[PDB]
Design a protein around this ligand. Structure first.
Ligand SMILES: O=C(O)c1ccoc1CN1CCOCC1
Lengths: 300, 237
């Protein structure tokens, strides 16, 4: 188990760690999060008590370094940093643990939720979507726009998701206009899977990361990408059976985790009704259809 | 965006534009079969592609062979229309290509946009005008060429005859839309109005009677009376 210590908590803040959250008071003796499960990416996220504007946070993998959080009073935020002095870092953690100034990652043993939401998410792929090569962790916030959003403005601070556009030359073979527009199989399988992503695991990793950024930061462009990657599969008549079965699992756990009260802002009615009731794959997503119908029947 | 009564003069400016109407592309008769079921039989159709400034009409005849062995024909017909309009644009010299294509039915927007991806600077637009171009097949010389066709064919016409020698495009389009609305509302009476005077004939190279400026006023009045008469019969007014 790994640990992200905090130097201090000078401003009152709601802190998220993956799907968990807790409140910290101004100048409370809070010095970090322990017992973080090795083997998965994680996200540590923030929303300031005095200004709910800008949710922001950091994706990290404790196998890649020793990371801590320290508040910067000039830039006004909690910043992730890497400590290269290993013995210094272990000494800091041990003291804070002995004084019980850390919260424990509150994972129940039966509970596979985080694995289910991050199964295909790799830190190396996150670092290509979020470009800042001098750090091993990745900053995301509520306002960051995507490359696609920009095209339609600082590129160093963008989310470089793979651009999906159903009415584009990339999606439509000259001479196959009706075919490719009504059945997106060639765009999914040849262009996206064989060409850009190389395999379905990388495609699902990006879909999963997009959902997580939409949910944890309210990042609109990420929500757009998540729905586009769903619709591309559902609008394809020829999809490998293992991908359809995995998609049903991925989406089921995403719908299960979504806050009930954010459904109005995180779910696109058109996309979900098309996908579940009109598309080629309308009968291939049984688990997702069942949870959607029982949890959000109004949207449908 | 959408073309309506607010931006109507835009139709007659010097930016090349085409209206595309697909209502006569896929045409059928419905009949009972020997077993008492119902079947359709396709008949030849056409794409109505019109430059409203110059009157040039690109009538692409859609021969029934293009439907053979195809499914979902009403859907295919939109895509075939878009394919053919795309081909027409590519066939035209650059300086004759349209800057805007206005579709009379919103279901044509996606098929045309997809077929015109190679032309990102040609705007594809709907309209809020209710245009009577479905009545094109009530113009005898157009219906004749469509029905006689034995293979796909493009035929070029000027739907305004020589009216632009004496009136503006705006007025010519107004006359055309009134004539077509009348033919749509009561075809038999509209044709009777147009042919009632045997001394006024249709030139071999024209679609409509060689009426004088004063006769066109009378004809236009009679067309408006027809439309109003039919409105009263319909709604019992
Ligand atoms: O041509 C004229 O001098 C004229 C004078 C008033 O109206 C017309 C119409 N022209 C051309 C159309 O066919 C009738 C004859």
């Amino acid at each position: 188990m790994n640990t992200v210590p905090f130097t201090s908590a000078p401003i009152e803040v709601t802190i998220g760690i993956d799907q968990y959250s807790f409140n910290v008071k101004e100048n409370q003796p809070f010095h970090g999060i322990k017992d973080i499960p090795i083997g998965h990416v994680h996200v540590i996220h923030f929303q300031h008590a005095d200004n709910s504007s800008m949710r922001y946070g950091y994706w990290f993998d404790c196998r890649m370094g020793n990371f801590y959080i320290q508040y910067d009073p000039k830039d006004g935020l909690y910043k992730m940093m890497e400590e290269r002095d290993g013995a210094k870092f272990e000494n800091i953690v041990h003291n804070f643990k002995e004084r019980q100034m850390m919260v424990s990652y509150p994972k129940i043993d039966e509970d596979d939720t985080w694995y289910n939401l991050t199964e295909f998410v790799q830190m190396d792929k996150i670092r290509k979507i979020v470009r800042k090569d001098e750090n091993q962790f990745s900053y995301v916030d509520s306002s960051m726009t995507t490359v696609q959003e920009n095209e339609l403005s600082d590129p160093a601070h963008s989310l470089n998701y793979t651009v999906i556009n159903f009415k584009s030359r990339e999606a439509i073979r000259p001479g196959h206009e009706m075919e490719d527009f009504l059945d997106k199989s060639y765009y999914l399988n040849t262009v996206m899977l064989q060409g850009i992503f190389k395999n379905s695991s990388n495609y699902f990793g990006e879909l999963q990361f997009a959902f997580l950024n939409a949910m944890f930061f309210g990042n609109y462009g990420s929500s757009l990408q998540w729905h586009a990657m769903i619709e591309l599969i559902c609008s394809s008549a020829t999809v490998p059976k293992h991908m359809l079965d995995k998609l049903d699992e991925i989406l089921y756990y995403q719908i299960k985790t979504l806050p009930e009260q954010y459904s109005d802002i995180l779910l696109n009615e058109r996309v979900w009704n098309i996908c579940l009731y009109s598309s080629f794959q309308k009968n291939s997503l049984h688990n997702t259809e069942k949870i959607m119908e029982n949890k959000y029947p109004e949207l449908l | 965006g959408a073309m309506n009564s607010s931006n109507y003069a835009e139709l007659f400016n010097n930016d090349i534009k085409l209206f595309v109407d697909d209502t006569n592309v896929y045409r059928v008769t419905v009949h009972k079969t020997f077993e008492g079921n119902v079947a359709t039989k396709a008949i030849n159709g056409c794409i109505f592609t019109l430059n409203p400034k110059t009157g040039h009409l690109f009538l692409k005849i859609i021969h029934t062979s293009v439907w053979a062995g195809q499914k979902r024909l009403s859907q295919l017909a939109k895509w075939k229309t878009a394919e053919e309009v795309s081909a027409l644009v590519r066939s035209l010299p650059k300086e004759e290509q349209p800057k805007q294509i206005i579709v009379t039915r919103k279901a044509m927007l996606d098929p045309l946009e997809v077929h015109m991806l190679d032309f990102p600077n040609i705007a594809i637009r709907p309209t809020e005008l209710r245009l009577p171009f479905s009545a094109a097949m009530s113009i005898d010389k157009l219906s004749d060429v469509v029905m006689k066709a034995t293979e796909p064919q493009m035929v070029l016409f000027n739907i305004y005859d020589d009216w632009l020698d004496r009136i503006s495009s705006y007025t010519a389009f107004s006359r055309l839309t009134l004539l077509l609305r009348a033919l749509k509302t009561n075809e038999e009476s509209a044709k009777m109005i147009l042919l009632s005077d045997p001394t006024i004939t249709i030139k071999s190279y024209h679609l409509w009677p060689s009426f004088t400026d004063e006769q066109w006023i009378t004809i236009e009045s009679q067309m408006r009376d027809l439309i109003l008469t039919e409105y009263g019969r319909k709604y019992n007014v």
